[PDB]
Ligand binder design. Structure first.
Ligand SMILES: CCCCCCCCCCCCCCCCCC(=O)OC[C@H](COP(=O)([O-])OCC(O)COP(=O)([O-])OC[C@@H](COC(=O)CCCCCCCCCCCCCCCCC)OC(=O)CCCCCCCCCCCCCCCCC)OC(=O)CCCCCCCCCCCCCCCCC
Ligand SMILES: CCCCCCCCCCCCCCCCCC(=O)OC[C@H](COP(=O)([O-])OCC[N+](C)(C)C)OC(=O)CCCCCCCCCCCCCCCCC
Ligand SMILES: CCCCCCCCCCCCCCCCCC(=O)OC[C@H](COP(=O)([O-])OCC[N+](C)(C)C)OC(=O)CCCCCCCCCCCCCCCCC
Ligand SMILES: CCCCCCCCCCCCCCCCCC(=O)OC[C@H](COP(=O)(O)OCCN)OC(=O)CCCCCCCCCCCCCCCCC
Ligand SMILES: CCCCCCCCCCCCCCCCCC(=O)OC[C@H](COP(=O)(O)OCCN)OC(=O)CCCCCCCCCCCCCCCCC
Lengths: 99, 318, 70, 175, 115, 347, 114, 98, 83
């Protein structure tokens, strides 16, 4: 903050909730607890400028964890080719597809 | 077979509402030493049928200065909401076992005011307009106490699941723990449901017929059906909340006997009140709620939040 | 006198009687005599989905136990 | 169908928003907004947000917008400005029904809609997460933390609400 | 599956029930029949005027009051927390401030709304 | 309004701004902005004139819209990063989104259209609060998030702020509208240096604070709102018009007066950042502020405008106000240039 | 950027318990304490190894250690099991409170039989 | 990013336009303002529910209770305008001008 | 003293409502501190096992944790069923 009074007197006002890998009720996790914990500990005591590029791997992985863009695109391309192929009758889904 | 069960729920209630006009007419007359409908069929049993199909065969005159689309949507919302009020009820085993049924109960009940506001505006008459404006004004004042009462009452229950109320009252009626709230909840139900003394919404004597001052024949029954359907449901809601009943899993028949018998007793005391008290007034209507009801509800809510902690009697959330 | 209103309310008791009986018996009938196993939490739901898959007939309400294992 | 049911609820949400955003009669705008208010709750319900979904019904459908009807009953411009009254509102309503119809078709065909953000038009169901919540409803435990960890928010939210009532009577007192 | 199906059934039940209450009775309305009813006398042209402040004032107080009660729905699950003392203090705060807002509103006229 | 009620209303407004400057969580930042807004309107409503009602309505609509638009910047940043911490955010659209959202609160770009009109409607004391204290909260966020800003987008917003803010000032009779146009012009100077080095963005803030307290409380002491009304004050109290012309010259930025210290340091910084055309143009537009500054100074004390025979009563009586902190205000607002290297204390 | 290594379906063909939910719930208390050692080993692996594929060997062990728990009761009083889990199955929430007599009868054997 | 998120985001943007593109009833303007926050309230629930940010389930109510507070101010100003002017028109709400 | 008793009784003469609510709210806040069962309430609240008590890696010299969910070691709640 502009005036980090919280740090000075050490009373936690908001930071208990600023990130999802902190203490959570009944100790139940967020969707990306594993990833953001990795990114946080990567970018501690480093600085915003350095952590932008050095801890890039932990970031886009964590961003992909909660956005799930490329994973969804992966499934979309899988599904798109499926209907672009089975409609031509080139491959038939096995029984476990249909139960 | 989920469908047939649905008609098995909505159809009997509509026929129950029709017969509610007859019994109320007779019981209210009996207080007045009258007899009530007894000529149309044995003990007036066919009076609801006579009233129902006479009004249906009466033309639904639309007022000249009315938005027809606006005039028609309000009964649809009013009647459908009233019938939807029963879908989470813990009747033997609740139909829609919504884990937050009480919130679902309150949200739908609070959404009923849109029928009042829209009917008054669509009618487009000063008498109907101020009749509706005060009607909702009476309406919107009290459910804050409804919410506070439920929050205090449900606090010792465990959650908002309506089915859980049965296991909470497995030994004694829940009224004994919160009888100050029981009368608090009961009076507020009359204000929501708009019966005397809280009939200034309609005010047959002094507001002609309230928002139904013009509303005639065809869709007038919808407000009348929705109104009287809420009477059973609010009394049924009070019956489960405070006057709980034992429920044997191998015989849900028995608890239905207890639940049903209680909810006619709760409806009977509704019109019993109507046949004894003068009609209230708009200012007293607000003053009673905001000056002597809200403070008491707050304190009782404060009493009931801390009560489980000071007694180590918090209920399981399940 | 007031025995003439009892015919009115007795029918009333019958009207409110029906919805309780139906939803009780349909739940009993559909779910093989047992009541509808409610799932207010995800634990109870995935309990049922295990039962539906484990029944061998794709209905949860069909219960089948020690006769299976060997 | 139930494949893309949340696709539907999102769609009436947009057309409901286009309704009142087209500046129709304030009651009619309220009608269009509460329709969006009603359908939006289903979107949250489909995600398991029952408690959050039920609240908007309580304090936003049966809450804010009810007192909105009072001002509409208080304003009462000399003639209703319902959709037939003006032609720009029809144009606003008609227009707002085009581009969202355009981009859904754009998103339904190739799914590479790049309006401002890159967006996938895949089925709504995908982004859901698989995992049991045990016996504790995650929505309920989150809100109940209001009185466990949300101490600071409770004071500020309460204090502002107290200041909320002091201002309202002071501005409305008319000196 | 069943939830909106239950919602769907009621709405159709209501709409047909008014539909056979609208087309069946053979609507035969005239000009005087559709004329507004005003205690049997002539309407002078109205229902388009503001109504002072009291109805508005109570609505806003209700809205503000409804918002605070919205903050205290989660109490039944709040009692199931591990730290009751913080929860007991905090929930008491909302109620006493709810009292204080009522207390001020009472003292400075307020609920005795304008006439 | 009851003084105890008035004191509390100011107390929350101060705390709301204080809340913004002390919150590490984006939601709490929004909380401070809204509850500061929630108590700003009644202060503007203290006089309760139809002009004030128009002013307060205008102020609320723009501030509520900006604050509501601010939420998406938080939500979009949340959506793409899942971080409520107020730091360098991770979305160009979100970064763009909030920059105009905060700019509308400050009123730099065409967004500035509410700034003059609201000041005109509401009282002099309320205008003093609105143009001085209500500018700390939006600036606090920008200082913290300065590292994420698009340089082109913010520099532009600063440019039109000084550009239009100074340009329209030549055509204002009412002193309240003059002050607001000066405020918009001064808004650009701090905002321009904001992406480069935040230290002298603050330095401009306290200094710009000093004159506006100095000018407005001088104007309140004068009890004048128009140029002609200000002109008559030479007869009653010629001394006050003398100090006002010092501040008018100082706020214009002529050396060695205090108002030159910000602009000088601002030019120095962007000159270090290789931006040398940008400082030059703002300096050229700085004379635009000086013109109507001179026009007021010409009308106030440099010349001697005609008075009215009814001024004779004012001679007999005396002022009952206490103008707290006025003595030290103007002195700290006119001669502090020799103490310039003290800006490292802000760092 | 690599291979999501997945075990072949061969090691996944492990014997699975085929019993309705109420059967597990009825004997859950008499199952947890008496098969704890493999259960704790598997779930320790789940939280320590943090990867599903690492605990495959233990995953079939608990399932196997469930079966030899679900076999002797057949060679012993399986009859009190029948109505007990039947009565528990009748409950919508599988509440033990209603069906306590059959719980006592079930508990009476395993105090002496096993 | 999922198609639904467009629907709320576009809902806000068209709600934002209605708030800015005026007409003659600032009452209607307030509707776009509270609709504006409804999309904000709605969308915020999706991410928080989706990502299981349990403690973040906080803000949908917190954003609600504060956006609702602006209704108190906004509607109160409505009747104030509708008292010195009687109506809720916006073209006449230009007394400031100079 | 005399004024307090008179004022309280006199207030109870005109308004019996707010004095009743004030008394109830007055009680609602003090005895929560004075109650001896609040510590019991938090103890049973902590006693509810919503989550799985994940086993701890046994490496020797922690005698407090049992090696079996029947051993006397570890936390016990024999007060609870009596409570
Ligand atoms: C950096 C270097 C430069 C800055 C240095 C720091 C000082 C800055 C301020 C200097 C003085 C400003 C001033 O007062 O000018 C006169 C100017 C006009 O004074 P006036 O002619 O007497 O008229 C004032 C009212 O209209 C008169 O209305 P009234 O007749 O109802 O009287 C009300 C008055 C009279 O006082 C009282 O009534 C006292 C309170 C009694 C009730 C409450 C008691 C319990 C609480 C006490 C709290 C203290 O109380 C107040 O006005 C309340 C605010 C002040 C006390 C609370 C302060 C916050 C806590 O003051 C104001 O208009 C007040 C504006 C709000 C405060 C100043 C905001 C501007 C500065 C912001 C930036 C500060 C630096 C940031 C970095
Ligand atoms: C350790 C103990 C803890 C708990 C202790 C609690 C305190 C002791 C108990 C106090 C009484 C119970 C709580 C308060 C109840 C009254 C609230 C109130 O405002 O009363 C005065 C109020 C107002 O009385 P008033 O208006 O004459 O005076 C109020 C005070 N002044 C004048 C200052 C405003 O009474 C009413 O509102 C009258 C009833 C109105 C509704 C009409 C229908 C009544 C039907 C009655 C018969 C049916 C009853 C059904 C009951 C439920 C059945 C399921
Ligand atoms: C004013 C009355 C309310 C605040 C004081 C009483 C409650 C204190 C509290 O909850 O502290 C929480 C915390 C300290 O936490 P704590 O130690 O009380 O409880 C911790 C609970 N767990 C472990 C679950 C997280 O303190 C604050 O939030 C102080 C905020 C500022 C208070 C003063 C404002 C002026
Ligand atoms: C336990 C130990 C303490 C026991 C109680 C001791 C104090 C008793 C106080 C009694 C009330 C105050 C004195 C009194 O008689 O006031 C009467 C007056 C009536 O007001 P009214 O009916 O409007 O008529 C006059 C104005 N027109 O009253 C008023 O004008 C005051 C209006 C106040 C409005 C809010 C009142 C409280 C509302 C409920 C708060 C929550 C419950 C209590 C919490 C207490 C916490 C400490
Ligand atoms: C950087 C460039 C300059 C910037 C500043 C320029 C300011 C002036 C510019 C022109 C202003 C407009 C034209 C003139 C306006 C005059 C205003 C006015 O009120 O004039 C008349 C007035 C009459 O005087 P009066 O108020 O009665 O006070 C007399 C002294 N008691 O006169 C007054 O009120 C003036 C009173 C002045 C009092 C001066 C006191 C001096 C004390 C010196 C002490 C020295 C101690 C030395 C110690 C040495 C050892 C340590």
């Amino acid at each position: 903050p502009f005036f980090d009074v919280q740090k000075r007197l050490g009373l936690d006002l908001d930071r208990w909730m600023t990130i999802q890998s902190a203490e959570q009720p009944h100790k139940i996790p967020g969707r990306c607890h594993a990833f953001e914990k990795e990114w946080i500990e990567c970018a501690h005591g480093i600085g915003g400028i350095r952590a932008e590029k050095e801890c890039k791997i932990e970031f886009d992985d964590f961003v992909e964890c909660l956005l799930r863009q490329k994973t969804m695109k992966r499934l979309s391309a899988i599904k798109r080719q499926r209907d672009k192929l089975i409609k031509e009758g080139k491959y038939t889904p096995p029984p476990h597809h249909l139960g | 077979m989920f469908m047939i069960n649905i008609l098995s729920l909505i159809i009997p209630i509509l026929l129950a509402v029709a017969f509610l006009t007859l019994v109320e007419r007779k019981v209210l007359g009996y207080m007045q030493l009258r007899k009530g409908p007894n000529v149309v069929g044995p003990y007036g049993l066919l009076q609801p049928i006579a009233d129902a199909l006479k009004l249906v065969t009466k033309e639904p005159l639309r007022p000249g200065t009315s938005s027809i689309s606006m005039f028609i949507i309000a009964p649809i919302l009013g009647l459908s909401l009233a019938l939807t009020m029963w879908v989470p009820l813990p009747m033997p085993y609740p139909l829609i076992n919504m884990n937050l049924g009480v919130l679902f109960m309150l949200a739908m009940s609070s959404l009923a005011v849109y029928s009042i506001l829209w009917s008054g505006w669509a009618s487009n008459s000063k008498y109907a307009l101020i009749g509706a404006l005060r009607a909702v004004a009476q309406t919107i004042s009290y459910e804050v106490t409804l919410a506070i009462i439920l929050l205090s009452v449900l606090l010792m229950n465990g959650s908002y699941t309506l089915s859980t109320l049965i296991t909470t009252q497995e030994h004694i009626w829940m009224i004994f723990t919160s009888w100050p709230l029981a009368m608090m909840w009961f009076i507020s139900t009359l204000a929501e449901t708009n019966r005397a003394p809280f009939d200034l919404t309609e005010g047959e004597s002094e507001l002609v017929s309230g928002f139904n001052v013009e509303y005639a024949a065809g869709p007038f029954a919808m407000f009348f059906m929705a109104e009287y359907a809420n009477i059973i449901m609010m009394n049924a809601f009070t019956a489960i909340l405070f006057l709980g009943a034992s429920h044997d899993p191998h015989t849900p028949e028995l608890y239905t006997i207890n639940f049903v018998l209680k909810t006619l007793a709760l409806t009977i005391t509704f019109l019993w009140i109507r046949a004894s008290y003068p009609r209230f007034r708009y200012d007293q209507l607000m003053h009673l709620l905001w000056k002597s009801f809200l403070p008491l509800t707050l304190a009782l809510c404060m009493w009931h939040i801390s009560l489980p902690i000071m007694t180590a009697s918090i209920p399981p959330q399940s | 006198m007031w025995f003439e209103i009892l015919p009115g309310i007795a029918v009333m008791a019958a009207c409110l009687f029906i919805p309780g009986m139906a939803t009780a018996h349909i739940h009993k009938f559909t779910n093989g005599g047992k009541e509808k196993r409610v799932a207010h939490f995800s634990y109870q739901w995935n309990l049922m989905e295990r039962d539906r898959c484990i029944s061998g007939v794709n209905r949860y309400h069909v219960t089948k136990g020690l006769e299976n294992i060997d | 169908m139930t494949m893309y049911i949340a696709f539907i609820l999102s769609t009436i949400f947009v057309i409901g928003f286009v309704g009142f955003s087209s500046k129709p009669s304030p009651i009619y705008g309220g009608l269009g907004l509460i329709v969006s208010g009603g359908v939006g709750c289903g979107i949250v319900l489909n995600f398991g947000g029952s408690f959050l979904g039920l609240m908007v019904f309580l304090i936003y459908l049966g809450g804010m917008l009810v007192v909105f009807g009072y001002t509409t009953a208080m304003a009462t411009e000399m003639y209703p400005e319902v959709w037939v009254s003006n032609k720009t509102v029809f144009g606003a309503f008609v227009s707002g029904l085009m581009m969202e119809f355009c981009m859904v078709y754009y998103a339904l065909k190739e799914e590479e809609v790049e309006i401002i953000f890159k967006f996938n038009g895949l089925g709504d169901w995908v982004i859901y997460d698989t995992g049991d919540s045990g016996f504790f409803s995650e929505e309920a435990m989150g809100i109940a933390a209001l009185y466990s960890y949300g101490t600071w928010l409770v004071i500020v939210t309460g204090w502002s609400l107290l200041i909320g009532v002091v201002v309202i009577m002071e501005i409305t007192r008319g000196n | 599956m069943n939830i909106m199906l239950t919602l769907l059934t009621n709405v159709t039940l209501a709409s047909l029930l008014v539909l056979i209450a609208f087309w069946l009775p053979q609507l035969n309305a005239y000009s005087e029949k559709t004329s507004p009813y005003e205690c049997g006398f002539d309407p002078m042209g109205s229902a388009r005027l503001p109504f002072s402040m009291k109805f508005f004032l109570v609505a806003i107080t209700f809205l503000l009051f409804d918002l605070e009660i919205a903050l205290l729905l989660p109490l039944p699950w709040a009692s199931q927390t591990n730290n009751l003392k913080t929860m007991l203090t905090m929930a008491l705060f909302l109620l006493i401030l709810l009292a204080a807002s009522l207390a001020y509103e009472w003292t400075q006229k307020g609920l005795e709304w304008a006439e | 309004m009851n003084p105890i009620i008035y004191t509390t209303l100011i107390m929350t407004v101060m705390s709301g701004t204080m809340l913004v400057m002390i919150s590490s969580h984006w939601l709490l930042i929004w909380i401070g902005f809204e509850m500061n807004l929630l108590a700003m309107i009644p202060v503007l409503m203290k006089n309760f004139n139809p002009r004030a009602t128009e002013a307060a309505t205008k102020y609320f609509l723009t501030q509520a819209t900006a604050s509501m638009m601010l939420m998406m910047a938080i939500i979009i940043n949340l959506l793409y990063s899942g971080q409520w911490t107020i730091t360098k955010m991770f979305n160009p659209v979100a970064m763009t989104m909030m920059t105009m959202a905060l700019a509308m609160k400050l009123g730099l770009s065409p967004f500035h259209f509410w700034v003059p009109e609201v000041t005109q409607g509401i009282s002099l004391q309320a205008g003093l609060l609105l143009l001085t204290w209500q500018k700390l909260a939006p600036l606090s966020v920008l200082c913290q998030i300065s590292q994420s800003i698009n340089p082109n987008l913010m520099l532009t917003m600063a440019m039109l702020s000084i550009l239009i803010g100074g340009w329209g000032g030549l055509n204002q009779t009412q002193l309240r509208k003059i002050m607001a146009y000066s405020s918009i012009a001064h808004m650009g100077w701090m905002t321009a240096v904001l992406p480069y080095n935040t230290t002298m963005t603050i330095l401009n803030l306290l200094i710009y604070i000093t004159m506006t307290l100095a000018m407005f409380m001088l104007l309140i002491h004068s009890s004048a709102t128009t140029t002609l009304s200000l002109s008559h004050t030479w007869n009653k109290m010629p001394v006050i018009t003398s100090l006002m012309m010092v501040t008018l010259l100082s706020m214009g930025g002529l050396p060695p007066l205090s108002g030159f210290m910000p602009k000088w340091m601002i030019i120095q910084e962007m000159t270090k950042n290789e931006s040398i055309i940008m400082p030059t143009l703002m300096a050229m537009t700085a004379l635009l502020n000086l013109y109507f500054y001179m026009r007021l100074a010409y009308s106030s004390s440099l010349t001697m405008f005609p008075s009215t025979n009814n001024m004779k009563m004012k001679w007999q009586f005396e002022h009952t106000k206490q103008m707290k902190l006025l003595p030290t205000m103007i002195v700290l607002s006119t001669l502090v240039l020799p103490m310039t290297p003290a800006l490292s204390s802000l760092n | 950027p690599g291979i999501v290594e997945l075990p072949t379906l061969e090691d996944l063909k492990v014997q699975e318990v085929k019993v309705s939910s109420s059967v597990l719930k009825a004997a859950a208390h008499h199952y947890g304490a008496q098969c704890d050692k493999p259960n704790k080993e598997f779930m320790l692996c789940r939280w320590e190894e943090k990867d599903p594929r690492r605990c495959l060997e233990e995953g079939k062990l608990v399932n196997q250690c469930a079966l030899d728990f679900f076999r002797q009761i057949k060679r012993h009083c399986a009859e009190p099991f029948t109505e007990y889990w039947t009565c528990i199955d009748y409950s919508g929430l599988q509440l033990f409170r209603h069906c306590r007599k059959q719980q006592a009868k079930f508990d009476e054997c395993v105090l002496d039989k096993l | 990013m999922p198609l639904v998120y467009m629907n709320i985001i576009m809902a806000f943007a068209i709600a934002l336009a209605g708030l800015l593109m005026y007409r003659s009833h600032l009452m209607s303007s307030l509707l776009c303002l509270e609709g504006m926050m409804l999309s904000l309230f709605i969308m915020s629930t999706l991410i928080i529910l989706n990502t299981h940010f349990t403690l973040a389930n906080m803000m949908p109510i917190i954003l609600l209770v504060f956006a609702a507070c602006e209704a108190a101010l906004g509607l109160s100003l409505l009747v104030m305008v509708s008292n010195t002017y009687g109506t809720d028109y916006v073209q006449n709400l230009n007394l400031l001008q100079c | 003293a005399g004024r307090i008793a008179s004022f309280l009784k006199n207030a109870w003469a005109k308004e019996p409502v707010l004095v009743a609510s004030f008394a109830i709210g007055g009680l609602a806040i003090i005895l929560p501190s004075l109650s001896p069962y609040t510590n019991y309430a938090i103890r049973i609240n902590r006693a509810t096992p919503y989550n799985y008590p994940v086993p701890l890696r046994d490496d020797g010299n922690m005698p407090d944790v049992p090696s079996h969910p029947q051993d006397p070691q570890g936390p016990s709640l024999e007060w609870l069923k009596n409570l």
